[PDB]
Curated annotation (Swiss-Prot), chain C:
Belongs to the LysR transcriptional regulatory family. GO terms for biological process: DNA-templated transcription; negative regulation of DNA-templated transcription; positive regulation of DNA-templated transcription; regulation of DNA-templated transcription. GO terms for molecular function: cis-regulatory region sequence-specific DNA binding; DNA-binding transcription factor activity; sequence-specific DNA binding. This is Probable HTH-type transcriptional regulator LrhA. Not known, does not seem to act on the proton translocating NADH dehydrogenase genes (nuoA-N) which are part of the lrhA operon. Keywords: DNA-binding, Transcription, Transcription regulation. The chain holds residues 98 to 290 of 312 of the full protein.
């Protein structure tokens, strides 16, 4: 057969290595089409059966969703960046939609923290680069950590964040089913 | 409103350096950084879609300032087993990528048997397959993570050309942002 | 123009000593730098005996001035594909005493009635990280240890939160070393406007 | 019983995750204390039988030595470090002994390149920290590469460097049956 996997850029390089390793070890005859789009497009890709399985950081509402990894989410800035207390937090964000864009704005609002969109771009590479160059502050899971970056946390004025879930998602409505369930009886243990 | 195009490769490696300097010396100026695949960089700078370009493929018709020279290495999974004797299983982009063109030529010019074990459309798809131990690729030395192991001559792979990180400009436009920023980044690498 | 002796613990030598040594050897380009790197516990003794003029540690002293250079979150780590069986005592990878992180991880887990066992005790950090990555157990370290070999354990895995780790530049006020104080006075004027 | 492995500070965290991982899956039956000392002191530890195995990047003369990893060795400096042309190359090195210091000076003499010791340190973390702080140049295996750093190659005028071998080391003239059984386990599992 031909297994098509959809993964967000975010979960593509963090948790797809471990999955894609296991896919090509138990079913070694099977061709692998890994399609990477933004995290927003992942629902439409699984609904329209463009992909057989999905690895996302945004829980869907209509599809069974197995959790592969839960990461703490951190505020990030450049290692030598200066977070100016008093002015709005200068945010470096994706354009609409990334739940993370939606999520970080909600979190700073619920803490009465002014913010600003210092840099909006359409891809993670543009966002990652802008934080590292120190154009402002962003939020991603703990796996984005490089020596380029520093964590901004409560003492710098930034509120706690929800966890990141890296979710394998499957549509109940044959090769999608067996691979999901092979990851599910191999996830807990045994 | 300076629009900078950067290859998927060179986006996080060499654009932090540039994007830092533009938004510090000319801190007023809005930034549209559009990042596409490595091949589309040539087309984008001529068609005036971008003001500037940062790629690892030297163009022939554009000014090209070299921002960094890194060695290119073969990579496989840290725990990968490369079976010497049977064909080199490549993890590559689909056409086009100069890295693909360079890898096949370097394997062809040294008469090494190979195969496409995995052809992908994006770097995140390629990296995942290398790290999962689906085959080998060649990328600049900046991709080295603990997931990966370096293949060198010892394992049967010939040396690879350097990776050049290029800031590129089209002189045939009226773009002051392009020209003065290209000359400004020339005032740092070699004033 | 003198020879500045800086003491750093294994952890804060790697994380923030590049940042420190960069700032020192740009304002005083003539000044020689002797950095002696030991465990985190020997750091208090070293500054009082003026074996070093200044110290960078993650354990706040009781007797010394302390400039805060970075406050990082502290996280539990295990190997990326490690399996934490809920129900068995947590197998810990630790240093022997003394190490602040040990005292914290033991105090942390005791403070919330979670059983543990010493799956691996090591003598040095390179041994500890190697043991965490080998999937021999759990640890707690600042977020700066995070590599792809590893996975972070949080609340959903049954582990309590951790107090932050502070990377502190310290000075002996019971001293006469213009070197220590004036270099100390340089580091807060770049970490704060 | 108790398996004592010595690792260099260098190779302790690079390739010892794999070995100590493999020891504890085939023999979860034995306790193991890994003590990491400087890269030179590894040999004396195995001859004086303080440790049963060694993992080093400096080949010893008296002991069995399994090749576990051959990775390219590179010049490093700070990502934005500025290497002047003719002026002598300012080196960031350990003080004697680290064979790496011996190797950097040996190869820089084979091509007649002027140098100077801009920064000598006591520990690997102090040397790497000075390289990252951008006080000069060092040469370390490709596993040191982080975004802090840039690689110096031929383009900038520094000569080529030899590979690094991460070697599992054992003394055959000592009858540690546990040492050899772990050596052959890493030898029958480094070759499938």
């Amino acid at each position: 057969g031909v297994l098509t996997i959809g993964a967000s850029d975010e979960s593509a390089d963090t948790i797809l290595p471990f999955l894609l390793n296991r896919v090509s070890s138990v079913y070694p005859k099977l061709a692998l089409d890994v399609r990477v789009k933004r995290n927003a497009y992942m629902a439409e890709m699984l609904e329209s059966q463009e992909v057989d399985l999905m690895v996302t950081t945004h829980r869907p509402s209509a599809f069974k969703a197995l959790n592969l990894r839960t990461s703490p989410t951190h505020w990030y800035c450049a290692a030598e960046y200066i977070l100016q207390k008093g002015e709005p937090i200068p945010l470096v964000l994706l354009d609409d939609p990334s739940p993370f864009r939606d999520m970080v704005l909600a979190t700073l609002n619920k803490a009465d923290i002014p913010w600003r969109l210092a840099y909006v771009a359409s891809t993670l590479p543009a966002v990652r680069a802008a934080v590292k160059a120190g154009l402002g502050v962003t939020a991603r899971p703990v796996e984005m950590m490089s020596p380029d970056l520093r964590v901004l946390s409560g003492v710098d004025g930034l509120p706690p964040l929800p966890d990141t879930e890296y979710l394998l998602c499957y549509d109940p409505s044959e090769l999608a089913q067996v691979i999901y369930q092979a990851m599910e009886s191999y996830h807990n243990p045994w």
